[PDB]
Amino acid sequence: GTGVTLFVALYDYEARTEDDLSFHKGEKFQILNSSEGDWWEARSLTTGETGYIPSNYVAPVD
């Protein structure tokens, strides 16, 4: 409510660790938790996979 949770990747990113997600620019994400500020927990609408993503790499859509 009020807060937007659908995001789009602005750049390509390759997971560095076992916890983070890799993605293509243009890939959409449902955000599961954004309370930490640097790393957000999310789900890829493309693979159905779950994991962390850098918040500075994605932008709000719709």
Partner 1 sequence: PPAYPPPPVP
| Positions that interact with partner 1 (CB under 8 A) | 11, 16-17, 19-20, 36, 38-39, 41, 52, 54-57
CB of 45 to partner 1, least distance (A): 21
**For residues 14 and 6, what is the distance between their CA atoms, to the nearest angstrom?**
20
Give the residue with the Cβ less far from partner 1, 45 or 57. Answer: 57
**Cβ–Cβ under 8 Å, residues 54 and 39:** yes
Which residue, 1 or 59, has its beta carbon nearer to partner 1? 59
Helix (H) or strand (E) holding 7: strand 6-9
